[PDB]
Amino acid sequence: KMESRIKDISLAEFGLQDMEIAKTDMMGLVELQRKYRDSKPLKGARITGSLHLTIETSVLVETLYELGAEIRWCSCNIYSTQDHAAAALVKKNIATVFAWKNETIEDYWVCLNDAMTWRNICGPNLIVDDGGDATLILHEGVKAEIEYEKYNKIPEYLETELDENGKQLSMDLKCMYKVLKMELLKNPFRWRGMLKDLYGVSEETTTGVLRLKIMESEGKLLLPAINVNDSVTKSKFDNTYGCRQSLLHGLFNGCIQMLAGKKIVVLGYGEVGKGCAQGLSGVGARVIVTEIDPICALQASMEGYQVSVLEDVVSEADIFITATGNKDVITVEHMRKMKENAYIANIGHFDDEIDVYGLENYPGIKVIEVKQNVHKFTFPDTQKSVILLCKGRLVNLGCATGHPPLVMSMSFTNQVLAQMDLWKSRELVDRSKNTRFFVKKLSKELDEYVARLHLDVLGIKLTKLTETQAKYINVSINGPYKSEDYRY
Amino acid sequence: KMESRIKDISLAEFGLQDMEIAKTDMMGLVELQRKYRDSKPLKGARITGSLHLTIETSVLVETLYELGAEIRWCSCNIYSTQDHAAAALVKKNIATVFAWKNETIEDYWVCLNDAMTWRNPNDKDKICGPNLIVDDGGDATLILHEGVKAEIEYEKYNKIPEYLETELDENGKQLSMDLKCMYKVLKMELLKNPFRWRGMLKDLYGVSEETTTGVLRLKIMESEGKLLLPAINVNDSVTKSKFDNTYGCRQSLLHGLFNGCIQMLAGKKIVVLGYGEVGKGCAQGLSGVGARVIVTEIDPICALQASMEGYQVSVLEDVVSEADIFITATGNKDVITVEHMRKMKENAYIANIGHFDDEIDVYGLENYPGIKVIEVKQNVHKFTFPDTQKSVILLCKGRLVNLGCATGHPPLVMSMSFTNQVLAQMDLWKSRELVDRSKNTRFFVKKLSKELDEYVARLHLDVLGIKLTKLTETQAKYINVSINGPYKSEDYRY
Amino acid sequence: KMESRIKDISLAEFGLQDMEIAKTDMMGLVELQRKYRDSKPLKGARITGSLHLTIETSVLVETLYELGAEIRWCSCNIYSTQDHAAAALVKKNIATVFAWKNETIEDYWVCLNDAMTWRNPNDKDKICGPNLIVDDGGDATLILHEGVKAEIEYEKYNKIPEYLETELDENGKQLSMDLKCMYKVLKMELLKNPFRWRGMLKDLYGVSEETTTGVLRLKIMESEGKLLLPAINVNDSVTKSKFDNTYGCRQSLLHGLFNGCIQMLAGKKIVVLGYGEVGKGCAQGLSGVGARVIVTEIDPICALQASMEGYQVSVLEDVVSEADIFITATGNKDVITVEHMRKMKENAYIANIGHFDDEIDVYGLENYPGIKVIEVKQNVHKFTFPDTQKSVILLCKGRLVNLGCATGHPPLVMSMSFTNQVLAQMDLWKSRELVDRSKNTRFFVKKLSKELDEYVARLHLDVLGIKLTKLTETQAKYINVSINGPYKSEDYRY
Amino acid sequence: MESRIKDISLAEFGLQDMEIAKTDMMGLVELQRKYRDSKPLKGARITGSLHLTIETSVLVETLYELGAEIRWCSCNIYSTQDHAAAALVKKNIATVFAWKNETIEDYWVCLNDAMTWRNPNDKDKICGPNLIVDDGGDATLILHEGVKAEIEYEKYNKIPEYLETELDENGKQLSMDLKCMYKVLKMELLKNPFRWRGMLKDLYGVSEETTTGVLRLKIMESEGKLLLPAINVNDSVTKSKFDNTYGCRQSLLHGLFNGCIQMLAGKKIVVLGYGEVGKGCAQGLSGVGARVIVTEIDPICALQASMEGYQVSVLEDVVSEADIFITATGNKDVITVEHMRKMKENAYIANIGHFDDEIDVYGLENYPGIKVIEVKQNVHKFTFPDTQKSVILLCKGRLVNLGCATGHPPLVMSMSFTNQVLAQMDLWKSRELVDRSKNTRFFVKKLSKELDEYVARLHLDVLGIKLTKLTETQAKYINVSINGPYKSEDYRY
Numbered sequence A: 001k002m003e004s005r006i007k008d009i010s011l012a013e014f015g016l017q018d019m020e021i022a023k024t025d026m027m028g029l030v031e032l033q034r035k036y037r038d039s040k041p042l043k044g045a046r047i048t049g050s051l052h053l054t055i056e057t058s059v060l061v062e063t064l065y066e067l068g069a070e071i072r073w074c075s076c077n078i079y080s081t082q083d084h085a086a087a088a089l090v091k092k093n094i095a096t097v098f099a100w101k102n103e104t105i106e107d108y109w110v111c112l113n114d115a116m117t118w119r120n121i122c123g124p125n126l127i128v129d130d131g132g133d134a135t136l137i138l139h140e141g142v143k144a145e146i147e148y149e150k151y152n153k154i155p156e157y158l159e160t161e162l163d164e165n166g167k168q169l170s171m172d173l174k175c176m177y178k179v180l181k182m183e184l185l186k187n188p189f190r191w192r193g194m195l196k197d198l199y200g201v202s203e204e205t206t207t208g209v210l211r212l213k214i215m216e217s218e219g220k221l222l223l224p225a226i227n228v229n230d231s232v233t234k235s236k237f238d239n240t241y242g243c244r245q246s247l248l249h250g251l252f253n254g255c256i257q258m259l260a261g262k263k264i265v266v267l268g269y270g271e272v273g274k275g276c277a278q279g280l281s282g283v284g285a286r287v288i289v290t291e292i293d294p295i296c297a298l299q300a301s302m303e304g305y306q307v308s309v310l311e312d313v314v315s316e317a318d319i320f321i322t323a324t325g326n327k328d329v330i331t332v333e334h335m336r337k338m339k340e341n342a343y344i345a346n347i348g349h350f351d352d353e354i355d356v357y358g359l360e361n362y363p364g365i366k367v368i369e370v371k372q373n374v375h376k377f378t379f380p381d382t383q384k385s386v387i388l389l390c391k392g393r394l395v396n397l398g399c400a401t402g403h404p405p406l407v408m409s410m411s412f413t414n415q416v417l418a419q420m421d422l423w424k425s426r427e428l429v430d431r432s433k434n435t436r437f438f439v440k441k442l443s444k445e446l447d448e449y450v451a452r453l454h455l456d457v458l459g460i461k462l463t464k465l466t467e468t469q470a471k472y473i474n475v476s477i478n479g480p481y482k483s484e485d486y487r488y
Numbered sequence B, C: 001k002m003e004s005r006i007k008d009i010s011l012a013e014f015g016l017q018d019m020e021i022a023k024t025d026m027m028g029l030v031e032l033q034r035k036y037r038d039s040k041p042l043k044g045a046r047i048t049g050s051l052h053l054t055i056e057t058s059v060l061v062e063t064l065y066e067l068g069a070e071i072r073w074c075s076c077n078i079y080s081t082q083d084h085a086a087a088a089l090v091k092k093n094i095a096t097v098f099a100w101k102n103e104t105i106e107d108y109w110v111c112l113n114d115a116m117t118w119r120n121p122n123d124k125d126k127i128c129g130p131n132l133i134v135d136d137g138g139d140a141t142l143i144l145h146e147g148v149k150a151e152i153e154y155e156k157y158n159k160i161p162e163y164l165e166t167e168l169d170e171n172g173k174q175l176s177m178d179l180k181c182m183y184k185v186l187k188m189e190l191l192k193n194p195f196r197w198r199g200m201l202k203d204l205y206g207v208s209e210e211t212t213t214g215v216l217r218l219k220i221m222e223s224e225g226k227l228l229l230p231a232i233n234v235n236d237s238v239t240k241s242k243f244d245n246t247y248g249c250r251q252s253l254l255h256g257l258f259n260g261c262i263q264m265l266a267g268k269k270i271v272v273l274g275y276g277e278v279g280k281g282c283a284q285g286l287s288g289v290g291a292r293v294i295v296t297e298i299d300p301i302c303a304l305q306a307s308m309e310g311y312q313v314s315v316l317e318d319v320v321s322e323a324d325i326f327i328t329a330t331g332n333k334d335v336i337t338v339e340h341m342r343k344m345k346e347n348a349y350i351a352n353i354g355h356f357d358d359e360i361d362v363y364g365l366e367n368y369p370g371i372k373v374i375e376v377k378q379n380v381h382k383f384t385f386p387d388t389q390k391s392v393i394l395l396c397k398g399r400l401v402n403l404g405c406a407t408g409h410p411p412l413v414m415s416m417s418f419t420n421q422v423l424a425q426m427d428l429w430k431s432r433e434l435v436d437r438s439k440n441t442r443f444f445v446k447k448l449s450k451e452l453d454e455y456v457a458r459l460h461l462d463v464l465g466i467k468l469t470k471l472t473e474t475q476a477k478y479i480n481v482s483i484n485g486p487y488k489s490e491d492y493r494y
Numbered sequence D: 001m002e003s004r005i006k007d008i009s010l011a012e013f014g015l016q017d018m019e020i021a022k023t024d025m026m027g028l029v030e031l032q033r034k035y036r037d038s039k040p041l042k043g044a045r046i047t048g049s050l051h052l053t054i055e056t057s058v059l060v061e062t063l064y065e066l067g068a069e070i071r072w073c074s075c076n077i078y079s080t081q082d083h084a085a086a087a088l089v090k091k092n093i094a095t096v097f098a099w100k101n102e103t104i105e106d107y108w109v110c111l112n113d114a115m116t117w118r119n120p121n122d123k124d125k126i127c128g129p130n131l132i133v134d135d136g137g138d139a140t141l142i143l144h145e146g147v148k149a150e151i152e153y154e155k156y157n158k159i160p161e162y163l164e165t166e167l168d169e170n171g172k173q174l175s176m177d178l179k180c181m182y183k184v185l186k187m188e189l190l191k192n193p194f195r196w197r198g199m200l201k202d203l204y205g206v207s208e209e210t211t212t213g214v215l216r217l218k219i220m221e222s223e224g225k226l227l228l229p230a231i232n233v234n235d236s237v238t239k240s241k242f243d244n245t246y247g248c249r250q251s252l253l254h255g256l257f258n259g260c261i262q263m264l265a266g267k268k269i270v271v272l273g274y275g276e277v278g279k280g281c282a283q284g285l286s287g288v289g290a291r292v293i294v295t296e297i298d299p300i301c302a303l304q305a306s307m308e309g310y311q312v313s314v315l316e317d318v319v320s321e322a323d324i325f326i327t328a329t330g331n332k333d334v335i336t337v338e339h340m341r342k343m344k345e346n347a348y349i350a351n352i353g354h355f356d357d358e359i360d361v362y363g364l365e366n367y368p369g370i371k372v373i374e375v376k377q378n379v380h381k382f383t384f385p386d387t388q389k390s391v392i393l394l395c396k397g398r399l400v401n402l403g404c405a406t407g408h409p410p411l412v413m414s415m416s417f418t419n420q421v422l423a424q425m426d427l428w429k430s431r432e433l434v435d436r437s438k439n440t441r442f443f444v445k446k447l448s449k450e451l452d453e454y455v456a457r458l459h460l461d462v463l464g465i466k467l468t469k470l471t472e473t474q475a476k477y478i479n480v481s482i483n484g485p486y487k488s489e490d491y492r493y
């Protein structure tokens, strides 16, 4: 496909308006445009992006374009796209987009595959990823081509509708496999052909980084990678403060009830859980925390929160928010013990945290649409119901518009810097000898730079060290100011 | 009009779903239905309501209906109606509704007038008014009193009064759109029947007023001896002012800002003008998500309260150029002027949470010479001045942002406010016989008792799993109160 | 007793230093001194005070002195006196003081009686009483009323009444130490002069009551027609109840706990019994340092307020075995019983912040069969039950922890409370002539006006750099108030 | 030989507080229960330089129950709790040299005494400790400076001139701490010029408790001057994220409430430094209604403060209007005399960073014609002669939480001290690998994440925390062991 696939081009005007307003606070991206718009450090680069296509993301895409790159983009979640944002990008020819709000799981993988396809067929030079789906289709595509040549037929794991243990494959796996199968019939050298020109990936979130580290250990990582999620100016701000506002927005839109005085269980008290808890407390809720890490559990106590095992609180709590990045944290057996009209939502990257499949396929269960992406499930034996927000997917992006511009600018300034780093290192990626790669992070020098670029947004005034002071604490006047192990 | 005027009847199904979910937390109204649905304490009563037609309001209307009343309803703001809620009411024949989201100011007054019009049960042909009124902001009460004034002035000179035909006030300034459109309706009614409004007085037994601003208008009429019917101040029940006004807004304001303002609130300087019941709640919510609240206030006691909560207290002039967002919660007039807005910084957001659009000089802004306006989104406008080229974003034309850009307060707290409403309506209706107009031309404003105020609270304890302690005989005697209450003096401030 | 009784006069220098520092924030008292030191509105008045003798109280006493009054003072609690503050007053001859930290209950009543005793200015040999009383808790008011009762009963049978000699109450139970020691003083005074107390009535013009508990005792006397002098309820001024009671305790409780309890508050389950003016503040402070507050309450309205602030509301029975710390703020009796304390866990801390030691059954605990007690530190005792071998730590024998283990509320907020006191004393004194005892005559309890309540707040705005906004003529008219106030209705709850 | 303390009769009150404190110090209670029989530290001589509080008494008791002989001194002239010191000497747990309100001269004599041990083989001779528990780096400093002084003594065969002078290399007066330390080093060169180097033979390591002391250790490591192995206890997650932050949240307030008579609500309080400590200080101050203004040099920390609703300014722009100033930088000359002269009447100034350098106290006390008066125990009001304005300083610019109050509470100190005991056990168990016949560089290391999580587990029951346990599938999905560790080494919590 050389032209874009979006919902409505006429929404472009509203998108450009929001983009300009958003830029007031996205000073990091505005500075990169101002500074590098003439020198074009990314000239000639082909960038494919798999990341929530929001207004904030449009400014990221615009920044990459102003720096000389050609762009192809898709969203990393079926409900997160903002149609007016997508329209703005195609209206100005900044990028070729394959994204719309409320995609089917089938269309999600077709869009991702389209975004990965470039014309003279070849692939991208760089990848901006959030969740690891773009990275996954690449690696699984290479595996599928190896297995295809070995037996000279379509591999049986792609045609079966079951996994290795007899259980149904997830819809995401079936739809991806379906795309990989269609591509083996067109060209069985497609994916391995892309490797010649791939110079790296920037990964945005915790869950995607986990998938990258697993590949690194096993020696299966096929391109350089930069962990953007673990920059201080991303994990300590986006993950925490972003969700503090973003979760509330999502709950206010999907849940009609008052949060004050309710017992709200936050499962997981990591970077995201901490923020969720702050916001919920901020509007009068009584947060109960669930956690497996004894250090994180103690942190929750120190902030005045009760720490319990879900089993002891499931019958009495009013709302459940999963923020673990784990699997089967809320089971169907848990949901049956919940009380009438208990709300369930997820803010971790995938829909595995809540057993949504088990709930939808429960024998004789009744489901009704309460509103746009909010469903009420009623069990036949007890006659009790539970309300699920946007089928267990990211509520902050599914029921609302995700994090606001200021924090996304910090996350995206890191992305641009990561893309520039990977591109500037092209020459060192020699595949005639080195087919195996590692995950690295951006330096603390750049991490502090990202923070400096956003100080004027909030009228912050930094103090400057004197020569003597700098020497006393043993740091340079211009930084960095802390050790690599410092936790902020 | 004997049939309803709404946006879309097919949205009724979604409305009934939200109503059932909302009822999980609205235990006060659910209890009143359970208790009085058989005895019908309001049987035969004709109730007209002028109050934001939200899902929460649908449950209020349903409660009044289950208690035997016939209902006619309209919204008290052009942007607050939830079309699916309105559809649910007409779908089940609970009430006759005249309301839709995004009404014109002209249609607002026509809807209110329609809601006030009833067909005479004796002679299905003639016109009469309601027996009771549920009001929020005082507009239903205003059209009644101004209608009576207009009829007095009509008979005196035997012609349409000149104050209704002019488009200017007593000083040469343009009348507000709300006054022109109301006057236009009063004029049309003088041509149909010049005894319409005074005719309604025979059967009017009272009004329940929901908000601070409407109560102010009632107290002014009481002092001047111009109040034409009994009134109950629902806003000053402890279970309304200390919960709805404060905790309702804590959530409700944030919802409105999140929907209308795309920016992050954390670290921003947000000015909350007015630190009363509403301002206090607004400040709590804003702080809750990391904002730096600056407070403006005229009351030295309220100003000190703000300091004790860690907030800076300043005059708007000293903070207008640096602050990022402005929230008016004063119940006053011209708190944000055009001269203030010109000194604001690029893309500063302005919003109002007090009952009317007077707090911000919206008329002055829209009519500023050579100003450019553009719609950022549904009910959000960006105004750009021609000389400085700087812009300000206004949320829903300076009207209630919590109801204009969002869905207002959540069910739990509205159930507390509405349980008071039902009790007020039952009180006014039960006192009918004492309202003798052949002699008593003087009416007053009263409040519900503390006994009932505590009752409202008891009805909602199970929603949040609250467990009350019960006094022993000795304890009750020691603190000099009954085991069953009331537990505090009338002057207690909670 | 011409001369004072205090612990150590050499501590006077430190007291005068703290007084000057405290005055930086006590702008209300500093303004009254500046304004009235020349005109002496209280010249010739004899004032007896029964109120915690802290540095803050020294500035109150100094203010009354600069306004022309002669002063005699005692503390209203055996642990609250700050010896350096008492020394400062006697060093400068501002007042005659009878107070020291760690008084015995016996000495407490002797000090109060001494403070009530004055030398007749006409005939130096004879005795008389005060003209005005500054009271906190109602003990000065109590000894007066019980003294009059004792004299009536003395003349009736011409002998010492038997209720004063017995060590038991009407049901066989031991009298409280406070009753025994007061009775012992009243008995001595009947032997010196059986017309002493009734003689004081001739010149008594009123009492200013500082706290909730004392006001309750005044209202009971008012109903029964037993109140023998005019009274002003200072506690219910907005600038007292909404600041002192709430914000004072937010800091003051923490100070007390940090000094008496060695443990960390963060993450602990702390039960606050009573969520009134004081409880609300206690909860804010505790949350502020990471505690998990659980609330007990009998009032459904107050219970709901606690929920809205994110606190769990439970009955003590359901949380007594698991909670770590217990804080009583009810103004009630037997809220923590010995049966409750036996179910508590090892080294659970128990403290009280309500005015008297009745909230916790301290007598029952100290007299429990075979119980072992040990002093952990200055005014902190650990009690160990013999059967379970478990222990509970009690802070300063169940008396005011904020004043017993720490120094009470800080200057800023006490200045607001004490500015009301001075204004109350001036009011009572200026009304002398209207107090005619040759006639019926029932006395009542009244409050200060809102005009004065706002005045108190204005006097403290500069302390925190608060900038008030001023209403325009139009704005004042729109909201129907004077530009200079008052700004709210009498029923407004702030 | 025998201890030096204020009053032995206060011992009974100390033992009472120790037992109460142990209810929450479950980490130390568990170590005692577990290792009291096997005595993993048997035969070890431990010298400690750390605030002698009730909490510290439980640490000392734990080390004793594990078989060590102990000598102890405080690491600050105002932090000692006399009843705690008395308790240790009453039960013969340790030999103590500490009392509240020491003179700077006596502080260094106490530290030197604590470092002195009687040779077990030949009772006549002197030796040093095997292990050192340090907080601030003073025990580590006297050792290194003592070795330097002995090298310079033999070279020139005379007392080095830098020890006799009362001035530094630029003509400025030496700090009292340097003069008094030098005075002790000089006296020891006259008794025995091989004393300090003699201790090196048996030194197996030091556990450093605080940020500032770690900085001093890292400087020595870079320069190749570190003379013994070291463990950075301060950077364990169960120390920096709890003690530094949550400890101060309560501890600062306690100090201010005791030293400052004023109400904190509504006041503009400047917290200089928004690091681990600053964050906690700000939380507590906000908790009681103050309006916190933050000062910071780090753009990342500055942004963190904004996100919590705090204004971030340079001191110059807020010094005339702010009411209270709290230094938490670990830096030098953050509050100067020129700053204090611009402050308003009765502005309060306090420090919570480890040393008194953050505030120019020397400059203030020695200002021409200044008047000083004692407001109370360790609180002084200084009045400038030209403007007539005054500033109140809390405990001469030293740790206000420990100077005006009792420091952090037991729960968090148990977490910090459980790390200490584990560090001491680690250093002692590695003795054999410390071979000085080969002159190797010594480095600073940290405890493992396995142990860091262990410390947290030991304190879960104190607050009734209930941990969830991962299933086999879950553990595999997130790629961790069911028993941990649960996070990567770079994770910031």
Ligand SMILES: NC(=O)c1ccc[n+]([C@@H]2O[C@H](COP(=O)([O-])OP(=O)(O)OC[C@H]3O[C@@H](n4cnc5c(N)ncnc54)[C@H](O)[C@@H]3O)[C@@H](O)[C@H]2O)c1
Residues within 6 Å of the ligand: A463, A465, A469, A473, A481, D210, D211, D212, D213, D243, D244, D248, D272, D273, D274, D275, D276, D277, D278, D295, D296, D297, D298, D301, D328, D329, D330, D331, D334, D352, D353, D354, D355, D399, D401, D408
């Ligand atoms: N009182 C206590 O009980 C206690 C407890 C723990 C640590 N400490 C001490 O507190 C100090 C700080 O500890 P930490 O762990 O927070 O250190 P940290 O590095 O975490 O924080 C120090 C902060 O100060 C900032 N800073 C440095 N110089 C500055 C200047 N001139 N102006 C503004 N900001 C400046 C740094 O950027 C940093 O954010 C250390 O001296 C440490 O020993 C004391």
Ligand SMILES: Nc1ncnc2c1ncn2[C@@H]1O[C@H](CO)[C@@H](O)[C@H]1O
Residues within 6 Å of the ligand: A051, A052, A053, A054, A055, A056, A057, A130, A131, A204, A205, A206, A238, A242, A349, A397, A401, A402, A403, A404, A408, A411
């Ligand atoms: N408004 C937004 N636009 C784009 N990405 C977002 C937004 N809000 C959150 N995210 C990203 O989505 C990721 C989770 O999929 C987060 O780690 C975050 O970086």
Ligand SMILES: [Cl-]
Residues within 6 Å of the ligand: A306, D464
């Ligand atoms: Cl619990």
Ligand SMILES: [Cl-]
Residues within 6 Å of the ligand: A482, A483, A484, A485
């Ligand atoms: Cl490093």
Ligand SMILES: [Cl-]
Residues within 6 Å of the ligand: B005, B006, B007, B100
């Ligand atoms: Cl229509």
Ligand SMILES: [Cl-]
Residues within 6 Å of the ligand: B312, C465, D321
């Ligand atoms: Cl200011």
Ligand SMILES: [Cl-]
Residues within 6 Å of the ligand: none
């Ligand atoms: Cl002009």
Ligand SMILES: [Cl-]
Residues within 6 Å of the ligand: none
């Ligand atoms: Cl005597």
Ligand SMILES: [Cl-]
Residues within 6 Å of the ligand: C035
């Ligand atoms: Cl005057």
Ligand SMILES: [Cl-]
Residues within 6 Å of the ligand: B465, C312
């Ligand atoms: Cl519960």
Ligand SMILES: [Cl-]
Residues within 6 Å of the ligand: D033
């Ligand atoms: Cl054992």
Ligand SMILES: [Cl-]
Residues within 6 Å of the ligand: D155, D156
């Ligand atoms: Cl030499």
Ligand SMILES: [Cl-]
Residues within 6 Å of the ligand: D160, D161, D162
């Ligand atoms: Cl030299």
Ligand SMILES: [Cl-]
Residues within 6 Å of the ligand: A459, D311
């Ligand atoms: Cl500012």
